[PDB]
Enzyme design. Structure first.
Site, PDB file in Angstrom:
ATOM      1  N   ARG F 181       0.843  -1.193   0.000  1.00 36.61           N
ATOM      2  CA  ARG F 181       0.000   0.000   0.000  1.00 36.61           C
ATOM      3  C   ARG F 181       0.881   1.248   0.000  1.00 36.61           C
ATOM      4  O   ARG F 181       1.867   1.315   0.740  1.00 36.61           O
ATOM      5  CB  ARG F 181      -0.916   0.009   1.227  1.00 36.61           C
ATOM      6  CG  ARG F 181      -1.765  -1.243   1.399  1.00 36.61           C
ATOM      7  CD  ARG F 181      -2.403  -1.286   2.778  1.00 36.61           C
ATOM      8  NE  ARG F 181      -3.106  -2.543   3.040  1.00 36.61           N
ATOM      9  CZ  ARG F 181      -2.544  -3.633   3.563  1.00 36.61           C
ATOM     10  NH1 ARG F 181      -1.255  -3.647   3.879  1.00 36.61           N
ATOM     11  NH2 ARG F 181      -3.276  -4.719   3.764  1.00 36.61           N
TER      12      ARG F 181
ATOM     13  N   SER G 117      -9.397  -1.919  12.052  1.00 40.40           N
ATOM     14  CA  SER G 117      -8.877  -0.703  11.443  1.00 40.40           C
ATOM     15  C   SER G 117      -7.493  -0.451  12.021  1.00 40.40           C
ATOM     16  O   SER G 117      -7.365   0.066  13.133  1.00 40.40           O
ATOM     17  CB  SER G 117      -9.802   0.486  11.722  1.00 40.40           C
ATOM     18  OG  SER G 117      -9.278   1.683  11.172  1.00 40.40           O
ATOM     19  N   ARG G 118      -6.459  -0.834  11.271  1.00 37.36           N
ATOM     20  CA  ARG G 118      -5.074  -0.744  11.760  1.00 37.36           C
ATOM     21  C   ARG G 118      -4.539   0.687  11.875  1.00 37.36           C
ATOM     22  O   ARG G 118      -3.494   0.916  12.491  1.00 37.36           O
ATOM     23  CB  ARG G 118      -4.116  -1.655  10.968  1.00 37.36           C
ATOM     24  CG  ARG G 118      -4.342  -1.717   9.466  1.00 37.36           C
ATOM     25  CD  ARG G 118      -3.592  -2.894   8.860  1.00 37.36           C
ATOM     26  NE  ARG G 118      -4.090  -3.253   7.532  1.00 37.36           N
ATOM     27  CZ  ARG G 118      -5.059  -4.135   7.297  1.00 37.36           C
ATOM     28  NH1 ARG G 118      -5.657  -4.765   8.300  1.00 37.36           N
ATOM     29  NH2 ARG G 118      -5.437  -4.388   6.051  1.00 37.36           N
ATOM     30  N   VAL G 119      -5.258   1.639  11.284  1.00 36.47           N
ATOM     31  CA  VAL G 119      -5.056   3.054  11.581  1.00 36.47           C
ATOM     32  C   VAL G 119      -5.745   3.311  12.921  1.00 36.47           C
ATOM     33  O   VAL G 119      -5.082   3.564  13.928  1.00 36.47           O
ATOM     34  CB  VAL G 119      -5.636   3.974  10.483  1.00 36.47           C
ATOM     35  CG1 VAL G 119      -5.427   5.441  10.839  1.00 36.47           C
ATOM     36  CG2 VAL G 119      -5.010   3.662   9.130  1.00 36.47           C
TER      37      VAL G 119
END
Ligand SMILES: Nc1ncnc2c1ncn2[C@@H]1O[C@H](COP(=O)(O)OP(=O)(O)O)[C@@H](O)[C@H]1O
Ligand SMILES: Nc1ncnc2c1ncn2[C@@H]1O[C@H](COP(=O)(O)OP(=O)(O)O)[C@@H](O)[C@H]1O
Ligand SMILES: Nc1ncnc2c1ncn2[C@@H]1O[C@H](COP(=O)(O)OP(=O)(O)O)[C@@H](O)[C@H]1O
Ligand SMILES: [Mg+2]
Ligand SMILES: [Mg+2]
Lengths: 51, 466, 117, 253, 480, 458, 128
Positions: F181, G117-119
């Site tokens: 990404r 959600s890795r954010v």
């Protein structure tokens, strides 16, 4: 008796929960083989139909 | 008259003729080869070019090499002077004993006997084997099939069936090695010389051998079944004498057919198989049959790809059979030999009107308790045998004893076990299981029933453990 | 949607769906351990869920040969009320097969008398 | 021919599985592209156009009929396969057979739950409708409690299990002895009315043999009246009850 | 200019090169590319020749000249190859120079038929206790080593090659065994480490290594087992005995599956071609035992199949099992528990190898086999507990370290102690310690008896009572 | 010579040549375009026409458009000037810091070192991290499979490995971003600046970045790993170094190879993967090795599709791995860092002949006590009280403060030498520190720091 | 447009599953080589080009952002299907929905354990 009955049941269902988990593990490996087998079979039916 | 090679790939070879084109199934002779190379015409491609399939290795062929039409299909030696001899696909002797001087020859391709030629005779053939005689007995002049995966005991079973039946059968026998082990052919040949059923010094030989093993190209393996079949056909018709036909392994016929089909420009069927799978098998299998003229008791070992009985090769074979013997890997791994599945082996003569009301009921009793035991298998593995009811525990103990009493020491497996070979009569086989079902040996241990002959030995084995 | 069919209609629909979904998880227990293991609260919801299952079923007027007895049409207002009553536990005294293959809730009461004698 | 000439005919295709295999070979070697399981695109239309030709004609066309009994062989019970799924959607019903039931003693091996008939009681005699009408749901109530049961069950649910087990035993039948409809109703009667509820399940098969042969040799007038009248008469219902209850107690001892 | 003995590349990409000309070329004949690469004539077509390229096809361009070699694909054979590491074509890749080979043999030669063969009778000693006793291998036999990765498959093969030094140094020409190790799809590092292990153990001098690594082209990997087999067939037909190991045949099928799919041939199970069974069968059939009229030589085969998740019902495993004369089966579960080698004695079989086992080993392994068979159905009263006691103790004897393959007479001594009930009173956890102390005792004190059993191949009344006094007295001494 | 485009289908471009044909794997430069579009020759179709895979988007291409033959495979910049810079697959800088002013260039398609060039000696690559060096050590010129989910410490472990290897041994590292990404490629770049492994204001950068993002054609993502491999090959072959190659992620390398195969019309093998699956892997993996000059050691991030280990993508990869570093979430939640599973992590070089004769027994004793601790976690007996305590005092000593982890915790990072790591865990097993509390071992360097921590809070 | 001119935009693709079905039709009919589930070998390239265009720009480029909420329709929860497989690995996180949760009463039917959600945390306010 009921103190004996309960603690022996604790182990009996602990052993049964081990046996069922080993059974799941063997079926999961079968599931993965069958999943791979179906993908390839669908893919051959498309290639052959094109060629 | 003369042809020319225009295309070569694997066993598939294309030949072009200037004048006079050879009909389909004609044998062609390749010139310039040190050993005989027979091309069998399979397709007319058009433009005076034929598509052929070889019967030996096609290495060392050149585009422009000459090919001659024999005028006929592949013709092999047939008759009494084939007994005791080994031959290949094209009927050439491979025993180094010289030429097979027969008075008659016959083409390996022939049409299957018509509907009016069929016989309806159904008579029990006692094998001496418990699982077979009790549950799914074989018939005289019937078609027998031995299903199984890799190493479960197809070959070991067919060899025991040769030993049990061929001696008590005053007639000729034919063995066709199809795509199997060559050293097995060596073992069978020299064993037969040792016993005396094949004689090199005399014409008393009773068995004819035909071999095309897993070292041969697909062309040879695809046709070798017909070569051994044609030998068997002659003895049936032009004598009247009864014939035994043993084939190991018939799957190799269909497998080799798959190898060539990829090169003949066919659109593949399911599982990558040939589109002509069922009809190729059909025209081949319908030649292996008893007629009004003569009787053929055929036993065929049938390989099962990846243990899948739904595979098109074993699945199509079922309808060509009169008695089935399906071997299981799980039953083999439990130590049960023969590894016969009691709930997947069938016979058309398993019928109270044919085998008797007592024979049938016991057979169905044995099967009922084994299916009842198979249903509990899950709860037995999770909880335990001790968590079952008193009704279920009784069936489980009896069924486990029945399982083991189904196993049997074989005479061919006299080294693999170190034990004595056992041949059990039908009446004693019925009686044995009948007593366990009625609850007469409930007190006896399980291992007493494991690998024994008659019911009397199960008692005598239990005495030593007391 | 509460703003379309009404808040009364919507809540009964979700209530019927909730007890049937909860019954499905209870069905997983009575498959192995049995009916004797359930709490008094549990078998109360099971009996209600099983009665709701059957009350969802009705005889069709084109299926005379299959169910035996004639078919009937049930008004919407009687449908909301019927399931509403069972969810409240108003018919915990009535038998299970009284709700099977009937019209409105009034037919279930009449069938309960017919099973006795 | 029979259908169009005021006669009734029964056809049996044994089997349409091997016919599809043959048609596939043809289609593949005619160079028509393969589809699912290598079968051609028109393999459904192959069987549909065939089985549609089975019909019941109106009286202006003769009132004749053609009944079709196609046979399909599955592989390891895989009812999802291309060929079987086609024929199931075509036909007016299916009779499902399983090896598990076959070796459990359930012969014929008819899975009642999976098997249906869309025509229904409109294809039954008035006698058979009376006895089989309840059987469907009564056996459905049984199969629900079958995979629901040794934790000990209450009197009501143990009764449902008992009834279902005893009706299942009555559905057992040997080969080559097809039964007349009046003889069928009589043996179903005894089970469906609970006259066998407190009988040991192992002897139901034994019961049916001896019970029927007694009704055959000594009560022809009863069977004859059920046959000709086409229903269970009030007098016939009383007579059937008279025989089964007295036979019961003799057999039980 | 000469489109009869020469040709030119039309197209190259999909695994195979299309070549114009070469009118006089044979089927399965080696050809020669401009760049220096070799290839095989596979497809003889009206307008072109399909060529399987033994190497990186980047070196081949459109218009490149192709020449006939005139010979069906062959490899150099003979005793000159011993001590050398070669690629799939028989070319030396160890930098030690050219091989002074005289004779050559075709790689695709058809296996010997029925008549030239005879039953196996000569033992093929691995030096492993579990193998040489329970799963005995004979000379000319095919024995499959099967199991998951890191279960010990290669380890069986290497310890077997190392074991042969005890014969290959002695003055008995018939009992010598020349080894060949085929590396298919393996890392180049694993093979480089493997050659050093054999060099330091002085086993390389009688070993030929054929290597087609992971970076080599698929055709080379396809060819590698056939080239190695031809090198072993030299010994077979010349009165000598050779051992071949295919490590592994699983990766050869992957290499062939690549070729087949690029050739656009119809795939089946796991996308494999229909002739994949035939790919192995023609190879392993060439391993045979020859009769006196053919010199009496033999080729023993040890093919290796890497299973997934312990599944033996898979397509490729089921093929080779139905080709070989039994299997040595390894299991990941057994390895983790301390059973090393991880051999599953219950599922392991040696079909024809039972006849090829010394008289002495048969006198102890036979009764060990039965007692282990008795042990498996129960795994508690005095009857079953004794069978469970004997079981676990005999199992500890089957445990073995690496790189010390034992002599037959040393193996027959340690099984003697277990079978004759000298371990019964000792606890299972310390059996290994007893085994080491007992073995070091008999080699130090009783070289007269170890040399006696080996020469006779048998334990007679003379040696049985002689070995009875040795173990009984030592056991009284052993107190830990 | 010059060529002309004759066909454009997605990322497949067919080019015809009048005089001479470019051999397979040659790089073709498309003329008349704003941004450099490279085409890699894949097939010779015949009639003087070649088939190519595009390294960038093919939109706007016309039939008959001029194409230049470079006469060689894709040539990328190599040297010390690459350190701290990010390049794409073709060798262009994508960090906007000017041109990569290098001294040499090298083609990305190179063959694996010959059999004779192979080093027979088996050596241990000292990482300095305690969990690894003892139980699952990295081998020089070996492959390590980095297992673990998201948020367990994979990047922190990578940044520390770059730091530790260049610190003690002086060997530079190379990072290959295979189909990653763009957002996380951006986040990784800045985290490396914060850690210190990449510096922008001097020439002390320890990593050279090679990126091949997700939005790029299969060809670019397929060859990006070979580009980083070529970057790493320079330091080993020319300057004789023990180099690290980070491949993230190895499955995405396989994924892009499948897509290339499918674009070229090649019939797919099992589970939809390329038929060249094992050879695409082989020709790539065999370049990672020990030679006479030095070694290339690779850490490869693993993804297991459908949680199925028998899947062809991981199954083919596993045959190349020499060691495994398995990270666990459960151990991360216990506060242990690095979050390495001390039993899951294995290594082939755990042999008394490769590593020291003192190394093997110590690590086996650590493995024994941890297995015994987990087996007895079900339940008070005498023998357990001593072993349970010791095992818990080993788990805490397996943890280590990282130099990269100063932004998370205030504690100072440590590089623990192999000799000090071996003797430490040996002393806990023998029973030397049975008189010390558990928390004395949590987050310390050598075992001398375990002594000092017990004194302070006493 | 908003992302480049300093503003913040949010886009919902409802759904990407059907878009892939539309592209499969196009590719198959052009006789482009079919792969797993008949999809061409550039269907990943299809979704990755679109979703990678969602970004947060720095203050030097205006400081604008484009957030993407694509939708995938699974069949019987099969996340291992080709189109679900591609999009899961491309996206930054997943919000999972199940039929059992919906009819249990837990609607919106979000699996807290499965959804990720890795954010995540970097977005939340101090109060949250
Ligand atoms: N009836 C039996 N008794 C003892 N062992 C058997 C029996 N059947 C099979 N086996 C074992 O299985 C092995 C393989 O048998 P085989 O008939 O060659 O299998 P297949 O022909 O099906 O490949 C034999 O070597 C033998 O050890
Ligand atoms: N008998 C044994 N005792 C101890 N370690 C062993 C033994 N056999 C194998 N090993 C070890 O196990 C590992 C895997 O063995 P290997 O032969 O490579 O298995 P495979 O061939 O199945 O990959 C090797 O590192 C080796 O050192
Ligand atoms: N060695 C370490 N020491 C302390 N904390 C760590 C360490 N490794 C990871 N962490 C914690 O885990 C979180 C994620 O780490 P990171 O390496 O980014 O994992 P991933 O790369 O898998 O997202 C960080 O916020 C950090 O607090
Ligand atoms: Mg066999
Ligand atoms: Mg190995």
């Amino acid at each position: 008796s009921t103190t004996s009955e309960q603690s022996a049941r604790m182990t009996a269902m602990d052993n049964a929960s081990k046996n069922a988990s080993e059974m799941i593990d063997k079926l999961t490996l079968t599931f993965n083989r069958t999943r791979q087998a179906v993908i390839t079979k669908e893919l051959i039916e498309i290639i052959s139909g094109a060629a | 008259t003369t042809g020319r090679i225009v295309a070569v790939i694997g066993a598939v070879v294309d030949v072009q003729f200037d004048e006079g084109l050879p009909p389909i199934l004609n044998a062609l002779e390749v010139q310039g080869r040190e050993t005989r190379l027979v091309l069998e015409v399979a397709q007319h491609l058009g433009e005076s070019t034929v598509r052929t399939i070889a019967m030996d290795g096609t290495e060392g062929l050149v585009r422009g090499q000459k090919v001659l039409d024999s005028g006929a299909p592949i013709r092999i030696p047939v008759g009494p002077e084939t007994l005791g001899r080994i031959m290949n696909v094209i009927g050439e002797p491979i025993d180094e004993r010289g030429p097979i001087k027969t008075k008659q020859f016959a083409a390996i391709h022939a049409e299957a006997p018509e509907f009016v030629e069929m016989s309806v005779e159904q008579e029990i053939l006692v094998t001496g084997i418990k699982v077979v005689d009790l549950l799914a007995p074989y018939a005289k002049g019937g078609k027998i099939g031995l299903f199984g995966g890799a190493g479960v005991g197809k070959t070991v079973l067919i060899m025991e069936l040769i030993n049990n039946v061929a001696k008590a059968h005053g007639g000729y026998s034919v063995f066709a090695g199809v795509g199997e082990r060559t050293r097995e052919g060596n073992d069978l040949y020299h064993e037969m010389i040792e016993s005396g059923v094949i004689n090199l010094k005399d014409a008393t030989s009773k068995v004819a051998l035909v071999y095309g093993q897993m070292n041969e190209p697909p062309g040879a393996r695809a046709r070798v079944a017909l070569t051994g079949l044609t030998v068997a056909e002659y003895f049936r018709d032009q004598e009247g004498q009864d014939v035994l036909l043993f084939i190991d392994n018939i799957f190799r016929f269909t497998q080799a057919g798959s190898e060539v089909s990829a090169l003949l420009g066919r659109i593949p069927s399911a599982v990558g198989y040939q589109p002509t799978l069922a009809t190729d098998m059909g025209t081949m299998q319908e030649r292996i049959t008893t007629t009004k003229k003569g009787s053929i008791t055929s036993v065929q070992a049938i390989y099962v790809p990846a243990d899948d009985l739904t595979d098109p090769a074993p699945a199509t074979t079922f309808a060509h059979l009169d008695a089935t013997t399906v071997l299981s890997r799980a039953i083999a791994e439990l130590g049960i030999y023969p590894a016969v599945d009691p709930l997947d082996s069938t016979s058309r003569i398993m019928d109270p009107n044919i085998v008797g009301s007592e024979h049938y009921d016991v057979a169905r009793g044995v099967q009922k308790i084994l299916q009842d035991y198979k249903s509990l298998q899950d709860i037995i593995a999770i909880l335990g045998m001790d968590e079952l009811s008193e009704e279920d525990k009784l069936t489980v103990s009896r069924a486990r004893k029945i399982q083991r009493f189904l196993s049997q020491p074989f005479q061919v497996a006299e080294v693999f076990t170190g034990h004595l070979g056992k041949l059990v009569p039908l009446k004693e086989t019925i009686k044995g299981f009948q007593q366990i079902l009625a609850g007469e040996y409930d007190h006896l241990p399980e291992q007493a029933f494991y690998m024994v002959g008659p019911i009397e030995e199960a008692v005598a084995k239990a005495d030593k453990l007391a | 949607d509460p703003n379309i069919v009404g808040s009364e209609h919507y809540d009964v629909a979700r209530g019927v769906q909730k007890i049937l979904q909860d019954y499905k998880s209870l069905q997983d227990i009575i498959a192995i351990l049995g009916m004797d293991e359930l709490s008094e609260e549990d078998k109360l919801t099971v009996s209600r869920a099983r009665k709701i299952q059957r009350f969802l079923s009705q005889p069709f007027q084109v299926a005379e040969v299959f169910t035996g007895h004639l078919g009937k049409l049930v008004p919407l207002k009687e449908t909301i009320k019927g399931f509403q009553q069972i969810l409240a536990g108003e018919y915990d005294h009535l038998p299970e097969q009284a709700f099977y293959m009937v019209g409105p809730i009034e037919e279930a009461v009449a069938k309960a008398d017919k099973l006795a004698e | 021919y029979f259908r169009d000439n005021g006669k009734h005919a029964l056809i049996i295709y044994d089997d349409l599985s091997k016919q599809a295999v043959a048609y596939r070979q043809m289609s593949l070697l005619l160079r028509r592209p393969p589809g699912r399981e290598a079968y051609p695109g028109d393999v459904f239309y192959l069987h549909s156009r065939l089985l549609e030709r089975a019909a019941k004609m109106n009286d202006a066309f003769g009132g004749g009929s053609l009944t079709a009994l196609p046979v399909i062989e599955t592989q390891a019970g895989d009812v999802s396969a291309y060929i079987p799924t086609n024929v199931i959607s075509i036909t007016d019903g299916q009779i499902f057979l399983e090896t598990e039931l076959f070796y459990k003693g359930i012969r014929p091996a008819i899975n009642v739950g999976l098997s249906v008939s869309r025509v229904g009681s409109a294809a039954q005699t008035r006698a058979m409708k009376q006895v089989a009408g309840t059987m469907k749901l009564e056996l459905a109530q049984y199969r629900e409690v079958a995979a629901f049961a040794g934790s000990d069950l209450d009197a009501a649910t143990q009764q449902l299990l008992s009834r279902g087990v005893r009706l299942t035993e009555l559905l057992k039948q040997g080969q080559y002895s097809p039964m007349a409809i009046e003889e069928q109703v009589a043996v179903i009667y005894a089970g469906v009315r609970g006259y066998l509820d407190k009988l040991e399940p192992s002897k139901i098969t034994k019961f049916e043999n001896a019970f029927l042969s007694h009704v055959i040799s000594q009560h022809q007038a009863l069977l004859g009246k059920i046959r000709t009248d086409g229903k269970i008469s009030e007098e016939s219902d009383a007579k059937l009850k008279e025989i089964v209850t007295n036979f019961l107690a003799g057999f039980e001892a | 200019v000469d489109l009869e003995e020469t040709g030119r590349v039309l197209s190259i990409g999909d695994g195979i090169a299309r070549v114009h000309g070469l009118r006089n070329v044979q089927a399965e004949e080696m050809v020669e590319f401009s760049s220096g690469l070799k290839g095989m004539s596979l497809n003889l077509e009206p307008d072109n020749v399909g060529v399987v390229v033994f190497g990186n096809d980047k070196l081949i361009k459109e218009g490149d000249i192709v020449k006939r070699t005139g010979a069906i694909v062959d490899v150099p054979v003979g005793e000159e190859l011993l001590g050398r590491v070669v690629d799939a074509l028989g070319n030396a890749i160890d930098g030690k120079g050219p091989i002074g080979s005289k004779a050559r043999r075709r790689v695709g030669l058809k296996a010997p038929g029925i008549i030239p063969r005879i039953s196996v009778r000569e033992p093929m000693q691995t030096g492993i206790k579990a193998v040489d006793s329970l799963v005995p291998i004979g000379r000319g036999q095919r024995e499959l080593i099967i199991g998951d990765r890191q279960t010990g498959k290669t380890s069986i093969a290497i310890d077997t090659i190392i074991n042969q030094k005890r014969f290959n140094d002695g003055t008995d020409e018939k009992k010598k065994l020349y080894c060949i190790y085929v590396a298919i799809g393996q890392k180049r590092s694993t093979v480089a480490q493997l050659v050093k292990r054999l060099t330091d153990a002085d086993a390389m001098k009688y070993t030929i290594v054929v290597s087609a690594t992971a970076s080599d082209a698929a055709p080379l990997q396809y060819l590698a087992p056939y080239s190695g087999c031809s090198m072993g067939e030299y010994f077979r037909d010349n009165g000598k005995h050779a051992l071949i190991i295919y490590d592994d045949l699983s990766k050869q099928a992957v290499a062939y599956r690549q070729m087949s799919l690029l050739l656009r041939r119809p795939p089946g199970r796991e996308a494999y071609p229909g002739d994949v069974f035939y790919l192995h069968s023609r190879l392993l059939e060439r391993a045979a035992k020859m009769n006196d009229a053919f010199g009496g030589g033999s080729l023993t085969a040890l093919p290796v199949i890497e299973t997934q998740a312990g599944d033996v019902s898979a397509y490729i495993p089921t093929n080779v099992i139905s080709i070989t004369d039994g299997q040595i089966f390894l299991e990941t579960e057994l390895f983790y528990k301390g059973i090393r080698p991880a051999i599953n004695v219950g599922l392991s079989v040696s079909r024809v190898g039972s006849a090829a086992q010394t008289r002495a080993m048969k006198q102890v392994a036979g009764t060990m086999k039965l007692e282990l068979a008795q042990y498996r159905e129960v795994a508690l009263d005095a009857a079953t507990q004794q069978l469970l006691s004997r079981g676990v103790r005999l199992t500890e004897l089957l445990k073995q370290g690496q790189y010390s393959p034992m002599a037959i007479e040393e193996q027959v001594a340690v099984i003697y102690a277990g079978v004759r009930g000298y371990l019964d009173k000792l606890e299972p956890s310390k059996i290994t310690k007893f085994e080491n102390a007992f073995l070091s005792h008999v080699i130090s004190q009783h070289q007269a008896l170890l040399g006696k059993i080996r020469t006779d191949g048998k334990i007679s009344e003379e040696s049985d009572a002689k070995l009875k006094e040795i173990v009984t007295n030592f056991l009284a001494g052993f107190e830990a």
